[PDB]
Design a protein around this nucleic acid. Structure first.
Ligand SMILES: [Zn+2]
Ligand SMILES: [Zn+2]
Lengths: 80, 84, 94, 109, 92, 98, 147, 79, 97, 94, 110
DNA sequence: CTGGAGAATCCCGGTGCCGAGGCCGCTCAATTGGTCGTAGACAGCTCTAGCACCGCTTAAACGCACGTACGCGCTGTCCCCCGCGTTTTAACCGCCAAGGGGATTACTCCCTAGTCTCCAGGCACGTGTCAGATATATACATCCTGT
DNA sequence: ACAGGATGTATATATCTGACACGTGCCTGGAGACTAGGGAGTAATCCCCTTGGCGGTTAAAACGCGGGGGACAGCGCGTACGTGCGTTTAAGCGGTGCTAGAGCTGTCTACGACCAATTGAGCGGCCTCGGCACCGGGATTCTCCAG
């Protein structure tokens, strides 16, 4: 499983930014947005997998995901 | 011409597999744990951080032992030239 | 067949008591349960620190209201203290 | 033959469970003992908070001509009332979205 | 017989095991996850000439100081192979 | 004669369109593929729940929309309306992610 | 530490001399070295040998030495003072660099001048706009400067 | 009152200099002291509500440390 | 007579203050400030010297952090002069408003 | 005349073991003690939670190691877990 | 008459008090029971942390030509070490000061 | 600055559905009734430390001139980003199939809480001496205006 | 770019001094030995859900082309703020004095943990219909180009 970081399409990034309400977007934004979104992923799943493996199970629950979000000060509602 | 055999013997003693105790198969040391076993020794043991040390594999990328592979192949040539 | 706990019945009762003719979604019910939980651990953890700082070993209404005053900002704290004190007084009256 | 079982929630005139909160506190590893009035006070505080949240959500939902409260109404109510916005400024709501605002510079003139 | 290329291969080993940054025989290995080899104290002068994150000496960037580990796989072999080479010089 | 709006009016209308609803904006299959590729660097053959990947999503677009909200104000403070890569790095340094 | 590092650098090159280029101390001062470099094969400098001096820093190899041509060379990145603009000599300096290797980098720069970062802007115009007569300018200079 | 003016203009200037600031406009001092006082009633309101809960009439340094701890501004050097 | 152009005394005093550790706020006016900020919640409080020093240290650390962030904003805005727009921008980005 | 506990003696032994010719100021010693207390509180809180969520009741080495792994950044965690594990192993061996 | 009492800290070759850590764990309202190896592991982790901090502070103080550690050395060490900085980026040190750094545009043209 | 054209947007009505809402076990988690050991409230003594005040110093704060360098408004440009038609691709939905791993219960036993006894390692309190603060005299690096 | 004058600025020696490192006495918290009890670790079993694949639809994505708005470099101007100097003021230190409130010990009783017996409240499961999501069509409105 390789080469899907470009799977975050340009229109998807534009739509995300426009949900935040930006008018005009430069062409040099997409790569570092990929990078920061990346960094957020290895910041969350790194803790999530540790949570799972501590319980000695190989399936990652939504409970552990929201657990990792909570421990980073960005708690999530809607999953328990 | 006589100490050569002792030298070679010490060589495999310091390089051979400790699990297999024969010719190595792309062995890789995960790090601080002293594992000289072949990669196939741990190819199915991947998990629990280590076969013995139980230290999690922080080096997710394969830290290839290029220098150690070089050393083992030079050991092979010294073996070949020693045993004419 | 395990038995699972939630605050759904109580949240639904409060919703029907406030707005008698308003529905609720399952996702909204889960969000409400998560919210009431998060508030519960916040208040309980703060009360634990208040109890431990004063070298106390019992969590009473004083520590809980102190924690409520710490966390609830301004107006909600003023309302929450009043409603909680009313409930405690009525409970002691029975 | 002892007496009719009366819930401590009915004793304090509340809908939130009091014995359940007491059990959670005593198994929550906060102290080896818990005062009697602490769960009663906490249940009232939780009931008031959820009542405020639900009434704001219901007002927002009836504004949107709907009878069921969805996470969009909850997000709108929380981010519209600044007090709850300050209380819950570090939590995101699933399918909550964002509130429609545009900076005045972006608007054409 | 075949002695000359024996010493050529000996030079090959000693080149592969020489301090790439320092040209000093590494008495006991000190390796990073980049698997580079130091003869000690090269890293400390590296961290003295600048007050920031370290840069990989031979490779590009794989070190931030004290990320090394006490690799002892060649520590025993250094003096060993030295004993064989000196004895073999004496032997022949 | 083909009809074309001036650049910006459709931008504002699609600002309004996406600031009123809550549909997921990132495509689910490539998102979960990327998430699985991220996870495979830690443990092999891990299994994911649909709820877990959905929660990771919900976190993902929330963080991105917050970052874009910050960088938009950063750009307008820069006396311009087009966001630039320097703006988001300034936003991420001010908040304390670097 | 700097002095000993110099000793092994000259020692191995003594047993393994470079094919064309050469260098060595000009006295007891190990910090000052002179080198003779010949023009790269099939290049405008072919046939000429350029002379340059090396100034080791006090903390060598931790800092790049001060090296400039004593022989004038026509180059978009080299001035009449012999000063050389080389990337490995300024920012990606690394103790792992050795005199033998860096000299080959000079040869490559002789075969591949970098007009993008010129030290003499006019010569950079000569190289990019018409490489052909730039060779003609470079080669005649070698006869009068490098020979 | 008037104690908010006690933070004199050179004090703000030298705080900015420690912050790495090159120059200060005239419209900065009345905003820095406003931010300062807002922070002060953000912290003191927690310190005093700790003290009153402790049945104390004085403000201890430990209560201040606890008040900073809850606001993500933990302090080292006071226990 | 000698006259330093504007820009060097500022740099030298930045250098002087960036290695200093003493408190840049005078003790007495700050104590008078905190004693009147705290009097609107409860009457006639008492304060320890350690407590007032902790308040001074914490507020000065918060202010120097806010100033370095708003200076970052000032360079980003292609300026070198601090203006309250940068203060407000830093305050809002850090989530304090 | 009340007896209060601090970590100053142990911090001093560690200093005299690492740099045998260095001293500590009183303010610096207090800062070090406060730092050690803060780290102890973080680790203990994380381990207690990790025990709580999995319906566990015992604070063992595994979940405190996990808490260290989540809280300590990068190879700080890698060195800390190894040094804790060797200490526990040698404690158990005797 | 039973045996010579050996401290658990000396059993594991540690200077931090294992018994004190165990008492704090059992009286810290964390769980109703605590394992035996938990305090041993915790003491080793804390010892590693304080040892790294102390050696960095000593290096800084010797660079400042002092034999006593003041909060300035601790501040400089933890803020210069990149990872210790993020671990302790949210803490404030009394009498610690800030780090010497000047923005590129602010220094003169030269 | 004032009107048509178009395009998106808004508003209204008919239709099917599945998720919100409601009802029936029932089981366990809530209640009620005694009992006991104890932690917190309460009283009393105290003395450390916080508050208040008076006098001498002077560093720092404050006020005013100045002139210069930076904030800021107006102008030209070109190029980089946006609106839109077109072709392609993979998301997306629906269905099906195998199974691995998550989710229970039994049962044992081995680890850990609790208790009593004993003592020494760590804490309270003197205690002198050397690292560090300060003064003063330098040598020395760097700005700044004139050339 | 260079140079001398001037303003800081790093360095060394001498001298005081109080904070620290050590030493000593003492006690309570840690250690050793013992006991009992339940937390959970392992084994066995069941099945919900993850994974994988296949096939049809089409909506979103890639690509491109024109073209215009704005990011940017430049310039000029004007006010505003750094730099300096003269004139205060109150911080700072010290020294003294007073006493309120923190901190400790000793009682004593309400009160919450704990256990046993009971029962009903909320949850799992299982229906059931209307709020709504959708489709379709008609009315409303805002931008844009031309006038
Ligand atoms: Zn093997
Ligand atoms: Zn070396």
């Amino acid at each position: 499983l390789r080469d899907n970081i470009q799977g975050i399409t340009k229109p998807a990034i534009r739509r995300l930014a426009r949900r935040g309400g930006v008018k005009r977007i430069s062409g040099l934004i997409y790569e570092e947005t990929r990078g920061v979104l990346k960094v957020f992923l290895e910041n969350v799943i790194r803790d999530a997998v540790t949570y799972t493996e501590h319980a000695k199970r190989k399936t990652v629950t939504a409970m552990d995901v929201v657990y990792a979000l909570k421990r980073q000060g960005r708690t999530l509602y809607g999953f328990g | 011409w006589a100490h050569s055999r002792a030298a070679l013997d010490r060589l495999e003693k310091l390089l051979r597999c400790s699990r297999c105790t024969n010719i190595l198969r792309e062995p890789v040391c995960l790090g601080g744990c002293e594992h000289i076993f072949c990669s196939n020794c741990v190819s199915d043991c991947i998990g629990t951080g280590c076969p013995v040390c139980y230290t999690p594999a922080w080096i997710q990328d394969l830290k290839i032992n290029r220098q150690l592979d070089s050393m083992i192949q030079l050991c092979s040539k010294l073996r070949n030239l020693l045993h004419d | 067949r395990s038995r699972k706990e939630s605050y759904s019945v109580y949240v639904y009762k409060v919703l029907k008591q406030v707005h008698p003719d308003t529905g609720i979604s399952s996702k909204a019910m889960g969000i409400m349960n998560s919210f009431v939980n998060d508030i519960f651990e916040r208040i309980a953890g703060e009360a634990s620190r208040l109890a431990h700082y004063n070298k106390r070993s019992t969590i009473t209404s004083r520590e809980i209201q102190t924690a409520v005053r710490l966390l609830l900002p301004g107006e909600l704290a003023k309302h929450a203290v009043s409603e909680g004190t009313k409930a405690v007084t009525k409970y002691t009256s029975a | 033959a002892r007496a009719k079982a009366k819930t401590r929630s009915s004793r304090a005139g509340l809908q939130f469970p009091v014995g359940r909160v007491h059990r959670l506190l005593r198994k929550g590893n906060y102290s080896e003992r818990v005062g009697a009035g602490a769960p009663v006070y906490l249940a009232a505080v939780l009931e008031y908070l959820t009542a405020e949240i639900l009434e704001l959500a219901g007002n927002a939902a009836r504004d949107n001509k709907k009878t069921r409260i969805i996470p969009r109404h909850l997000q709108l109510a929380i981010r519209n009332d600044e007090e709850l916005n300050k209380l819950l400024g570090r939590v995101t709501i699933a399918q909550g979205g964002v509130l429609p605002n545009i900076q005045a510079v972006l608007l054409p003139k | 017989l075949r002695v000359e290329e024996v010493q050529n291969v000996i030079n090959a080993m000693q080149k592969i095991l020489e301090c790439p940054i320092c040209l000093e025989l590494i008495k006991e290995p000190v390796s990073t996850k980049c698997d580079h080899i130091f003869c000690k104290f090269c890293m400390l002068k590296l961290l003295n000439q600048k007050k920031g994150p370290s840069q990989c000496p031979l490779c590009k960037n794989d070190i931030t100081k004290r990320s090394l580990q006490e690799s002892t796989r060649f520590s025993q072999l250094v003096e060993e192979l030295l004993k064989i080479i000196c004895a073999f010089q004496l032997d022949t | 004669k083909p009809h074309r709006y001036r650049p910006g009016t459709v931008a504002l209308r699609e600002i309004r369109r996406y600031q009123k609803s809550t549909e997921l904006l990132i495509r689910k299959l490539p998102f979960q593929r990327l998430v699985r590729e991220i996870a495979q660097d830690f443990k092999t053959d891990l299994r994911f729940q649909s709820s877990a990947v959905m929660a990771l999503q919900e976190a993902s677009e929330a963080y991105l929309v917050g970052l874009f909200e910050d960088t938009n104000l950063s750009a307008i403070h820069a006396k311009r309306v087009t966001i630039m890569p320097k703006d988001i790095q300034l936003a991420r340094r001010i908040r304390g992610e670097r | 530490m700097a002095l000993k590092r110099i000793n092994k650098e000259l020692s191995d090159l003594a047993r393994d001399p470079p094919a064309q280029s050469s260098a060595g101390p000009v006295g007891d001062d190990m910090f000052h070295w002179q080198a003779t470099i010949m023009g790269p094969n099939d290049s405008p400098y072919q046939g000429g040998v350029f002379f340059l001096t090396i100034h080791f820093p006090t903390d060598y190899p931790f800092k790049p030495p001060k090296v400039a041509f004593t022989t004038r060379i026509y180059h978009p990145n080299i001035n009449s003072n012999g000063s050389i603009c080389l990337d490995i000599l300024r920012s990606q300096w690394s103790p792992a660099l050795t005199i033998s290797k860096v000299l080959l980098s000079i040869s490559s720069l002789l075969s591949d001048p970098n007009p993008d970062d010129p030290l003499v802007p006019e010569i950079a115009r000569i190289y990019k706009t018409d490489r052909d007569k730039y060779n003609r300018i470079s080669r005649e200079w070698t006869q009068k400067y490098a020979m």
